[PDB]
Design goal:
The protein is mainly β. The protein has no helices and 5 strands. It is found in: Cytoplasm, Cytoskeleton; Mitochondrion; Nucleus.
Length: 57
């Protein structure tokens, strides 16, 4: 899977994270080492989101 959708709203509170809204589509570009964060791209740009806040489409 490469195309994902947000399960829950997540609000970025730092420079490298990416805010997402439930239902919003994102492209996932990888996981970090411990797996708790994914690198995502949406129409708002690119950054990290919780890996358990998204799911494949």
């Amino acid at each position: 899977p490469n195309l994902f959708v947000a399960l829950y709203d997540f609000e970025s509170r730092t420079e490298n994270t990416l805010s997402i809204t439930k239902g919003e589509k994102l492209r996932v570009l990888g996981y970090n080492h411990n797996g708790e964060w994914c690198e995502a791209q949406t129409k708002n740009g690119q950054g990290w989101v919780p890996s358990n806040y998204i799911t494949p489409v």
